[PDB]
Assembly symmetry: D2
Homo-oligomer: 194 residues x 4
């Protein structure tokens, strides 16, 4: 069955960018809930598809996307954050420069579209293997990033920031770059590019 | 495995309301395609679920809804049409009166929302089991009617009428009532109330 | 220009169901922001429609719905809450009983669909003037309730509850009934029914 | 006020790729209807905005997008078709090579996503001004291409092909390249790069 992954750091390790209380809730409550609900849904969807219970299989779809996406998104997110993440790899910086001009332009552009999400969602830097270029995108709710390989995600559900930042989502999006785990992001870029 | 159901009548049996050229293409090409694609998609979905490949399983959802819905919707539609439909059962008629005032009012209201569908989709009379009332709704593309039991569907994809009616969708929607299979609709209503 | 309405009570008056800090942020920051953005958008949409700038008018639509809906929804919401709201009017209780069986069934049913909103949104009790019945519905993000007259709304964006309830949205939805302004709700029902 | 533009050719001028019966219905009935409904909807929207009736203005958005998009899309489409299109300009061809490898690759990729549209909609070649690259996309129903400049559109509403091609959408999508107006597409590209 799907399981809640341990964080690769302690709950207070991202302070003062993301508080201990947020990390604890986000991991132990929000991500846990997705995982718990997903396992129930997965089991039902396996049942319905095996039996060709079509109307049921279709009805279960929103819940599998939401909870399964929730598990996917948060699992990537935890690996994408670090107290000391490093800097992009030489290859990744080179590609950032090619596709966005500079790391600064990428940060502004991804920060901007992420800030602009209406309601709950995620911003993503990804790598598109067909056109062989970095792209940025947003996703609603827990919809997983599709059509490109995820490299770095920014969660902008209110629960990702509210206890600390309250309504000031832009400050959280801007500050998250301070704890971007460029080691992990650079590894994901290398793997997407093999 | 899913199969294309035989029509319960011959291809020319609904003339002059729906042409035999339409019925043939609609069943032998359009429905058949949904069935053929459904079987493939269901196989791929069962594999993704068996492998625990969550992203892959989520990515197949639109195709399962579209082709699976296509199969559901058209399967119902063929049973909902007849040269000699009869009239609503007494219990269905009394319920049509309780919930819409008259059959006339129901036909007008459902015809109007069906005609108003933007793009491809369907109009439905359904029965809501929680509130024990008849309701009308539309669905986009091949999305199946959910949240109530389907009783009578009107397909307003352009392939359902264009060869005969061209752009004049309203003439098709108004005419289809003449071949509504009230025997089947009444049986579906009875089943929905069990 | 659209303006932020004053609350009909002081910021701490809904304690212990909704905290002073939440009321203050929700009103002075979140609702204010919708209003400020709406006025900018409204002015641009007036410009584009007057000039027949069609592609621009269409592009502005999501922002008008989001901010304009935000203004609509929160304006109703503040009037819907009270330290001592009273009980439903005789007419409204009678209708609740007819359409839902009891006030308890209505509360459970609306609470349930509201709890189930994926991401950000609202739950609503409304009155449908065509079929002359109470209904319940949900809306995504700030989409306004359409097709029926709003009577009572429950905001389930995370900002509506998080500082106090954290992840436990169900407790907030259940507790909000304690501060439902049945005087206001009963007035809205009478007005919808004239 | 919006008006139905004259076609830049006679109704039979695209045979055998698109029939004169199609061209006539498509322009005189389908496009004309979008134009007629657009003018009415725009008038209603201007009234709602003038009156400050926010709910009413928001409620008219789907109709403005659908009819307004309908007008935009078909207006472009007529200019995008010709018996004697010519060939891409040298700058457009060099850019097609830079962004897709070859014209062959572009035609295949756009044809495939266009064929894959579920229900009614459109395939587009566009130019993205931020990243100064060509891109391909699809749009649902009459949603206009947004976020990039439209260069070449393929209508895959069933009314665009059904009378000639019936269910065989792929034959229509593959054939339309033979009447793509590269003079117009090249002019649109040049304008997009200004
Ligand atoms: Mn989260
Ligand atoms: Mn059909
Ligand atoms: Mn709110
Ligand atoms: Mn068209």
């Amino acid at each position: 069955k799907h399981t809640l992954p341990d964080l690769p750091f302690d709950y207070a390790d991202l302070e003062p960018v993301i508080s201990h209380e947020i990390m604890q809730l986000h991991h132990q409550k929000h991500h846990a809930t997705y995982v718990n609900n997903l396992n129930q849904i997965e089991e039902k969807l396996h049942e319905a598809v095996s039996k060709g219970n079509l109307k049921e299989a279709i009805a279960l779809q929103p819940a599998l996307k939401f909870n399964g996406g929730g598990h996917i998104n948060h699992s990537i997110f935890w690996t994408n954050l670090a107290k000391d993440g490093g800097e992009p790899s030489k290859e990744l910086m080179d590609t950032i420069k090619r596709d966005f001009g500079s790391l600064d332009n990428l940060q502004k552009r991804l920060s901007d579209i992420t800030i602009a999400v209406q309601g709950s969602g995620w911003g993503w830097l990804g790598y598109c293997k067909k056109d062989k270029i970095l792209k940025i995108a947003t996703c609603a709710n827990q919809d997983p990033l599709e059509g490109m390989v995820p490299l770095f995600g920014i969660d902008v559900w209110e629960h990702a920031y509210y206890l600390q930042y309250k309504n000031v989502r832009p400050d959280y999006v801007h500050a998250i770059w301070k704890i971007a785990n460029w080691k992990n992001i650079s590894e994901r870029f290398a793997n997407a590019r093999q």
